[PDB]
Amino acid sequence: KCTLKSFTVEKGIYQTSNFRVQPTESIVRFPNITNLCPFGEVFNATRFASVYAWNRKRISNCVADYSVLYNSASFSTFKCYGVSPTKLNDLCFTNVYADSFVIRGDEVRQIAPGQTGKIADYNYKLPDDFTGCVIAWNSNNLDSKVGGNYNYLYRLFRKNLKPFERDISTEIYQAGTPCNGVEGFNCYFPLQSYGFQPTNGVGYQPYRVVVLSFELLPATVCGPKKSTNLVKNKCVNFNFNGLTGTGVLTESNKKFLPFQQFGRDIADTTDAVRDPQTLEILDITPCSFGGVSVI
Amino acid sequence: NYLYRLFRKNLKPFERDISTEIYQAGTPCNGVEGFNCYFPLQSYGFQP
Amino acid sequence: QCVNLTTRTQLPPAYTNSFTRGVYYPDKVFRSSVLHSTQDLFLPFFSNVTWFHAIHVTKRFDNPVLPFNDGVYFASTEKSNIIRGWIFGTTLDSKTQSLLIVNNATNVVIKVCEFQFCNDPFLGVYYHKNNKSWMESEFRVYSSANNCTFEYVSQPFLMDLEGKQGNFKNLREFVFKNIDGYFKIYSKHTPINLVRDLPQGFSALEPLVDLPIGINITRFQTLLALHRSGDSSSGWTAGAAAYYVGYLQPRTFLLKYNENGTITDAVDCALDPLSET
Ligand SMILES: *[C@@H]1O[C@H](CO)[C@@H](O[C@@H]2O[C@H](CO)[C@@H](O)[C@H](O)[C@H]2NC(C)=O)[C@H](O)[C@H]1NC(C)=O
Ligand SMILES: *[C@@H]1O[C@H](CO)[C@@H](O[C@@H]2O[C@H](CO)[C@@H](O)[C@H](O)[C@H]2NC(C)=O)[C@H](O)[C@H]1NC(C)=O
Ligand SMILES: *[C@@H]1O[C@H](CO)[C@@H](O[C@@H]2O[C@H](CO)[C@@H](O)[C@H](O)[C@H]2NC(C)=O)[C@H](O)[C@H]1NC(C)=O
Ligand SMILES: *[C@@H]1O[C@H](CO)[C@@H](O)[C@H](O)[C@H]1NC(C)=O
Ligand SMILES: *[C@@H]1O[C@H](CO)[C@@H](O)[C@H](O)[C@H]1NC(C)=O
Numbered sequence A: 001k002c003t004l005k006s007f008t009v010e011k012g013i014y015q016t017s018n019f020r021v022q023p024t025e026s027i028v029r030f031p032n033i034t035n036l037c038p039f040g041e042v043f044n045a046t047r048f049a050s051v052y053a054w055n056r057k058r059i060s061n062c063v064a065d066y067s068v069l070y071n072s073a074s075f076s077t078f079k080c081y082g083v084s085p086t087k088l089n090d091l092c093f094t095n096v097y098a099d100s101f102v103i104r105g106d107e108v109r110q111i112a113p114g115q116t117g118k119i120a121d122y123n124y125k126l127p128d129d130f131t132g133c134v135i136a137w138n139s140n141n142l143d144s145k146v147g148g149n150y151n152y153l154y155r156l157f158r159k160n161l162k163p164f165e166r167d168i169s170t171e172i173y174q175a176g177t178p179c180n181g182v183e184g185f186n187c188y189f190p191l192q193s194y195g196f197q198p199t200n201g202v203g204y205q206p207y208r209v210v211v212l213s214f215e216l217l218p219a220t221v222c223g224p225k226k227s228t229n230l231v232k233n234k235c236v237n238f239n240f241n242g243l244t245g246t247g248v249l250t251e252s253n254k255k256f257l258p259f260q261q262f263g264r265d266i267a268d269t270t271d272a273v274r275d276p277q278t279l280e281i282l283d284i285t286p287c288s289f290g291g292v293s294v295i
Numbered sequence B: 001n002y003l004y005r006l007f008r009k010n011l012k013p014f015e016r017d018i019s020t021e022i023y024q025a026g027t028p029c030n031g032v033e034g035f036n037c038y039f040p041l042q043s044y045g046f047q048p
Numbered sequence C: 001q002c003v004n005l006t007t008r009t010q011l012p013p014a015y016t017n018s019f020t021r022g023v024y025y026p027d028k029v030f031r032s033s034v035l036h037s038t039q040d041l042f043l044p045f046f047s048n049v050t051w052f053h054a055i056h057v058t059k060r061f062d063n064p065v066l067p068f069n070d071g072v073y074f075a076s077t078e079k080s081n082i083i084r085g086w087i088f089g090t091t092l093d094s095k096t097q098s099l100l101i102v103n104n105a106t107n108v109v110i111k112v113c114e115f116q117f118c119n120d121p122f123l124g125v126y127y128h129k130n131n132k133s134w135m136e137s138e139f140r141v142y143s144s145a146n147n148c149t150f151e152y153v154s155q156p157f158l159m160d161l162e163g164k165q166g167n168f169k170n171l172r173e174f175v176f177k178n179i180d181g182y183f184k185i186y187s188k189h190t191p192i193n194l195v196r197d198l199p200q201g202f203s204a205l206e207p208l209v210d211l212p213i214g215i216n217i218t219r220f221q222t223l224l225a226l227h228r229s230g231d232s233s234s235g236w237t238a239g240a241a242a243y244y245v246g247y248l249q250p251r252t253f254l255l256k257y258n259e260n261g262t263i264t265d266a267v268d269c270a271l272d273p274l275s276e277t
């Protein structure tokens, strides 16, 4: 009656609407996660270099997962600038630079973009538009030894460091009669040690710090891309390798070539897809739908 | 004096959300400031 | 340390005819018993291709300069695996990133990295007369590298390396493309029984790899191997082999997909009015 927009209906058959089966139990299927960059090598490393000679590592061509690092809760400081601790999983970048070093308690504040300080100016200067994260965790049981761990060194005298600049040439600094490269008046040593003690408090205890920066300009490393289980014989919203569709998956007798992922029927419509997890071929058929006539 | 919400799970047009309950980012802290949860409000800090 | 190899006679370049070759799968879509018209970078049917020889008989050692416009079809007619690898780049002197692929005696190396490439890079296999054995001994390709961004080495294995006598019995077809920062390599192998030709018939090349390199390539070169048992630049034997190089351009092809799902025939859309129809 609403379809004909009248309160009287003549004898006959009328097409009113279309019954469609709503999809249920949506599934996402992504390939096996078996290629992870050695984040443990950066973190779990037995020894760390000095802050003026911080360890530099490249990260690319993996399937990274930052959720485990965030949920570890073993890090005293986890500060991300330009990104959030969450939502970092599903982002891709061309490459990642990892800078590892060891600092003291008060040095944590100085390791930040836009923050002034002697160390932030002569040891490690962060760019103003820095995008990435900084992770600092206490290492009183590893980087602190009875009697003084003086293995970690920081520049003390310097005439300014550009962002992400490495300066291994730290010749004797002249403060103004020149000493001609000899220790003496008007020229002091450029380096100075920390001397971490077990007796030192939280403000002077050693802290292992790793800075991760993401650079993008094709992306090489991406996130875990978590997947779900496989369900058949039901109208399902499926996502196979970024191909999103709706329909029921059934066992198919078609044999795919090893290099072919999904098949298309006549007129470029998807007909069968191979799930990357187990290399199984499934025919996709639209679930039941059709017109509804009123007699 | 001026504050803006920083952490939230989306708002439809023309809503007011006066409640500022602590936001959980994923072990839950159970309404206590700490890990996996940060303050939802942040100040502007206007200076001359 | 690398030294230019002398004693190489100069002969004008030879070009031969390619008959329905250089066709590959445009994408990873499975099709059965259909007709698909696709426009992509391809090699023309019945086209001209550069033919380079390697025969002792001069010694006809050919590792010349070859540009890389939009993609290269590389066919190798061989009997003892003389041709070893390929080099891609622009400056070839460590001032620009370059891609290197070498299948040495034990592994396969794909390395995107900055090489100080020699003007005459090559491989060298030593043959022992006291005991029958052929082994790789020399590898004069690059000098050093400071930055080196992409590394890939396959699992170790063993290769024949022996120089057999007779007609050619192996064909290795490759297609190299560089699009959207992705380096695509398609490959196939075929048994043949010819002495000197580019074999006719239809052969669809299956994709091999799609590396996310993201560099600029406008120049490519080949790497062969030589046999030793004279001086460092005169005492070398080439070994029978040949290779044909063709250049791909954007063309439209009509492919036929059979019930198996493989490409069994194709027609160029701009060759003759019959194929256009
Ligand atoms: C092979 O020949 C080329 C040029 O024919 C040589 O390149 C020269 O290398 C020297 C030192 O490396 C340079 O000073 C010259 O300027 C180069 N010449 C040119 C034209 O580029 C190359 O050194 C030779 N290889 C050898 C001798 O092993
Ligand atoms: C393939 O390329 C060759 C050379 O690049 C072509 O042969 C040349 O043809 C022109 C006239 O069209 C002549 O002036 C040249 O002398 C030829 N080159 C040589 C080395 O003789 C050839 O026509 C091209 N096409 C085919 C099908 O071979
Ligand atoms: C073929 O190339 C591979 C890779 O470049 C060589 O394998 C490397 O050999 C060096 C020297 O012993 C080792 O230090 C590396 O660890 C090897 N890399 C691996 C195994 O991935 C191989 O030696 C080369 N073959 C020959 C005959 O020289
Ligand atoms: C260090 O190694 C342990 C055990 O292998 C692992 O549980 C931990 O997650 C690693 N550290 C990081 C930061 O992932
Ligand atoms: C994917 O990983 C699962 C879990 O180990 C395994 O059973 C399956 O065979 C793997 N599939 C492929 C294609 O590697």
Ligand SMILES: *[C@@H]1O[C@H](CO)[C@@H](O)[C@H](O)[C@H]1NC(C)=O
Pocket: C128, C130, C131, C133, C135
């Ligand atoms: C036997 O062959 C090997 C190569 O496999 C070679 O290294 C060795 O020198 C040969 N033996 C003699 C006595 O030359």
Ligand SMILES: *[C@@H]1O[C@H](CO)[C@@H](O)[C@H](O)[C@H]1NC(C)=O
Pocket: C146, C147
């Ligand atoms: C290596 O990369 C750095 C990146 O800053 C660049 O400055 C340098 O020129 C490159 N080449 C060498 C040989 O260091």
Ligand SMILES: *[C@@H]1O[C@H](CO)[C@@H](O)[C@H](O)[C@H]1NC(C)=O
Pocket: C097, C214, C215, C216
């Ligand atoms: C390739 O050339 C383009 C020219 O616009 C340039 O922008 C790009 O940086 C180059 N890439 C490399 C890896 O040289």
Ligand SMILES: *[C@@H]1O[C@H](CO)[C@@H](O)[C@H](O)[C@H]1NC(C)=O
Pocket: C259, C260
């Ligand atoms: C597929 O190829 C096989 C031979 O490998 C052949 O016997 C068969 O007829 C082809 N077609 C099919 C299975 O539909």
